[PDB]
Design a protein around this ligand. Structure first.
Ligand SMILES: CCCCCCCC/C=C\CCCCCCCC(=O)O[C@@H](COC(=O)CCCCCCCCCCCCCCC)COP(=O)([O-])OCC[N+](C)(C)C
Ligand SMILES: C=C(C)[C@@H]1CCC(C)=C[C@H]1c1c(O)cc(CCCCC)cc1O
Ligand SMILES: C=C(C)[C@@H]1CCC(C)=C[C@H]1c1c(O)cc(CCCCC)cc1O
Lengths: 591, 50, 95
């Protein structure tokens, strides 16, 4: 009859130790859901503790029936902001107790309760996100029996299209819990396939895969953005038997011996529609394993024709820039007849690149921030175009300082030509994690080298006593292999200066060689990719932007694929041909 | 470095604060360290997560 | 038994750290037992909510609050070549 006594009895699980409790509630006109009988700190109730210490449950729910409780404790919600929304039904699912779930559900437990507590959010610290619904909890915990019961119970079925606070459905929840681990991949893939099959039986008129959350992403799109390659590949290459044939995404058109042709569904993948998978992977994805996404069987083939169909435009862009840079060099060399025409093209060329580059940053601004190394050449083209236009502005507004900026724009313009080198093989090492590491060390090495160069130069000046600029330049000549080593006999500390100069020679050789050894270890501890995943990602990024068209002339995008009636249902599929000599259809004859 | 640095400078010794939380394991009280791990293949002292 | 120190004033856990015996050191540092031997363990589980699990490692002689701790012994009083492999252990790496 006491709050402390009630919680102690339910822990033991003996209903005989709790007698007259119902009579006590009637005498005091109090309910089990009242704040007096809750834990207070988090709103935890007697039922919640009973499920935690897993029979007393049935009498405890039975004595709710005697008292005139208007609110059912079976649907009680926690009040603490950390653990808000968690209910007794969630405990039974978490404890993997099918019998407790059946007992709870049969007594009017709500299956759509939202666990919107801070612990259930996608935090960076302690947390666990399984949608926000009891149905999602069972799906993410390998409980097919609980999922089956929650989907096929006459008391209160749980809807598969229910959404969390973020709009995530059950399929979305499986995506957010993926971790590309071999144990986790089997968990998500098996449950995702099972839910789809059960979804057709329960709700055949509702298409689960087209439901989008508050961000407007389908479960297939969500996997691409979040970087879950394991579930992404399974969804992208999915096939089923006859009963679940319309639920598949990969189909066989015809099979003539070893030759087999497959049709992949380009529903949300092809870049004809906005916010496609290709656009999401290349630009809206921040996961490190972005390159491994495009090497998938349907994506690898599809991106090839787009590159092949638009390879001429890529070289046309290269030719236009190469000719423009040649014009820039000639005008600059003779800057001090046709030279008047040349300056017009420089101003027009600079303003053309500037406006075109300004479009790119207007369409997308987060992409440069999230992945600087992916589109760092976009920044470089902006500086070259802005400075070229600014340099010609200083020519009209004569300030006699346009030449240093024009010369600086000339050398950087040729550097931007290295961007087009991504259209070829170029061997090297292809990695993004390594490149950031290598770039960081070289900049740090330069800072270390400069301070040592500056530190020794001041030491040389004071001991020998031009200034620091001449002395530092003399020391820097040692790297270019042009240093001066001589015993200056007209110095008081001639030996000390000579020994100090020799110390710098031995010091700089170690520093340069250490960077070479440090750079050598990265090459040795690098595994080459036979599919050239990094190179394909760069090509995929370029073709997606290039197919959008220039700023001055937008180009209509033609959908890639063929409309085929799978059977009815018509999907724009992609033809892929494969040869298999070990395994021994939609159409009737090969074509 | 951190072991020496936490000792403090010579001119000002710094008091060292114990790292961990005193919990009654069960009684016996030990200053334990909280470590969180995620396992998807395997399917307690307190009662509720915190 | 574990708090008995020899003439050098080292517990068996501390002795393993100084002598460089990483194999026994890891087992002692991460040790758990069943109900009958629960107080004899050094690793405990606070709560378990599905895949998420939280563990509690006993910082009896490990934390550097007390003098002559395991961290001080490993870093400075240990001459074994495999000193680096000592700190990468699950409780030491996090702490
Ligand atoms: C202002 C300074 C910055 C602008 C100039 C450098 C631009 C970046 C650049 O050129 O990288 C260019 C190469 O890099 C080189 O080979 C030379 C780098 C210098 C292009 O870099 P990438 O296409 O990412 O190269 C990866 C493939 N590779 C490493 C096998 C070549
Ligand atoms: C591929 C790598 C790892 C090469 C190998 C060794 C060399 C000299 C440097 C590396 C490297 C970068 O680490 C980064 C870039 C371009 C990134 C932006 C540079 C401003 C080029 C670049 O050659
Ligand atoms: C590479 C090395 C080792 C050269 C050798 C001569 C000296 C000292 C300068 C070094 C150096 C950087 O340490 C860094 C950069 C730019 C950093 C990124 C380069 C892609 C250039 C750059 O010449």
């Amino acid at each position: 009859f006491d709050r402390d006594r009630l919680f102690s009895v339910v822990s033991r699980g003996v209903p005989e130790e709790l007698t007259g409790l119902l009579e006590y509630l009637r005498w005091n006109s109090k309910y089990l859901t009242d704040s007096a009988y809750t834990e207070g700190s988090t709103g935890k109730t007697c039922l919640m503790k009973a499920v935690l210490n897993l029979a007393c449950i049935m009498p405890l729910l039975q004595i709710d029936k005697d008292s005139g409780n208007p609110k059912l404790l079976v649907n009680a919600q926690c009040t603490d902001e950390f653990y808000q929304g968690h209910s007794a039904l969630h405990i039974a699912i978490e404890k993997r107790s099918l019998q407790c779930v059946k007992l709870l559900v049969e007594n009017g437990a709500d299956v759509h309760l939202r666990a919107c507590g801070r612990f259930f959010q996608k935090h960076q610290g302690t947390c666990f996100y399984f949608g926000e619904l009891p149905l999602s909890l069972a799906a993410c915990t390998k409980q097919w029996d609980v999922v089956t019961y929650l989907l096929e119970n006459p008391h209160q079925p749980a809807s598969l299209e229910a959404t969390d606070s973020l709009g995530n459905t059950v399929l979305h929840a499986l995506v957010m819990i993926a971790d590309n681990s071999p144990e986790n991949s089997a968990l998500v893939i098996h449950m995702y396939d099972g839910l789809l099959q059960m979804g057709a039986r329960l709700c055949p008129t509702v298409q689960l895969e087209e439901i989008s959350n508050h961000q407007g992403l389908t479960p297939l799109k969500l996997a691409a953005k979040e970087g879950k390659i394991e579930i992404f590949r399974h969804i992208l290459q999915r096939e089923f038997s006859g009963p679940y044939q319309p639920l598949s995404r990969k189909f066989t058109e015809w099979c003539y011996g070893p030759v087999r042709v497959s049709l992949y569904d380009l529903s949300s993948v092809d870049s004809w529609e906005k916010n496609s998978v290709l656009e999401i992977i290349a630009f809206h994805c921040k996961s490190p394993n972005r390159h491994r996404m495009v090497v998938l069987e349907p994506l690898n083939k599809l991106l090839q024709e787009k590159w092949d169909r638009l390879v001429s435009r890529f070289f046309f862009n290269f030719a236009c820039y190469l000719v423009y840079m040649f014009i820039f060099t000639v005008v600059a060399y003779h800057q001090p007849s046709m030279l008047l025409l040349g300056h017009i093209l420089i101003l027009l060329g600079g303003i053309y690149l500037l406006l075109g580059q300004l479009w790119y940053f207007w369409r997308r601004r987060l992409f440069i921030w999230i992945s600087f190394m992916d589109s760092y050449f976009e920044i470089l083209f902006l500086l070259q175009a802005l400075l070229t236009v600014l340099s010609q502005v200083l020519r009209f507004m004569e300030t006699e300082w346009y030449l240093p900026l024009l010369v600086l724009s000339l050398v950087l313009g040729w550097l931007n030509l290295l961007y087009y080198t991504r259209g070829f093989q170029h061997t090297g090492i292809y990695s993004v994690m390594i490149q950031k590491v290598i770039l960081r060390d070289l900049l740090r090495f330069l800072l270390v080298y400069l301070v040592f160069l500056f530190g020794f130069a001041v030491a040389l000046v004071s001991l020998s006593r031009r200034s620091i600029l001449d002395a530092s330049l003399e020391l820097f000549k040692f790297t270019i292999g042009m240093g001066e080593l001589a015993f200056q006999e007209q110095l008081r500390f001639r030996g000390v200066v000579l020994l100090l100069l020799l110390a710098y020679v031995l010091l700089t050789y170690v520093l340069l060689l250490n960077m070479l050894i440090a750079l050598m270890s990265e090459t040795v501890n690098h595994v080459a990719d036979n599919s050239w995943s990094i190179w394909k990602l760069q090509k995929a990024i370029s073709v997606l932007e290039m197919e959008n068209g220039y700023w001055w002339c937008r180009r209509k995008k033609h959908r890639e694929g063929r409309l085929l009636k799978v059977g009815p249902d018509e999907r724009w599929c992609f033809r892929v041909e494969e040869v298999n000599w070990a395994a021994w259809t939609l159409s009737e004859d090969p074509s």
